[PDB]
Design a protein around this nucleic acid. Sequence first.
DNA 1: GCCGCCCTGGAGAATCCCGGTGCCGAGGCCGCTCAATTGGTCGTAGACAGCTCTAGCAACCGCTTAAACGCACGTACGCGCTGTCCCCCGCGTTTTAACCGCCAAGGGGATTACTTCCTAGTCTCCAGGCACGTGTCAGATATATACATCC
Length: 50
Amino acid sequence: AHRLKNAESSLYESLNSFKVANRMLITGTPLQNNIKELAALVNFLMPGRF
DNA sequence: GCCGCCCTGGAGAATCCCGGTGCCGAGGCCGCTCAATTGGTCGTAGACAGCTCTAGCAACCGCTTAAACGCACGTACGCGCTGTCCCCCGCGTTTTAACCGCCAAGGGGATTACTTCCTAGTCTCCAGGCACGTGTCAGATATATACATCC
């Protein structure tokens, strides 16, 4: 899911538009460069509560 | 008497149609906001008139002479046909890199706002460079006259 670390990518816009009840991210490095990547991951998981 | 095989009826599920509701593209509405509008003033660009001098124009003349035109001939070249061979095209197969999607940070450049100062516009005055006309002067050109010479 570090490939999903950028919110402006085409994969993020493609996967975030899916109609899925429960999502899950499997990775080894949740934070790589800054807090913004972790913000993108937790906004992919829960869009708004964080 | 017992068991196996052929014919026909009603109930369960798939599909078409309609209504209620949510999402994409576009238009009406609102707000900022800066550039077009309006009004007034003034300077000057250009219209108008006038006089002078030079070029153009229509229609004719006359003369010269070189260019244009007509004609005959001839032959060189455009064009058509045929051969030939070679090179480009079509197709099948394999490779490969364009394309799209990704970092990773950093600089270039477009804006917005602000400050400052140097330089170019503007004005006044003046003088010398440019345009025109002319007197004069040295180089180029043509002939007048004297000397050596052939028949």
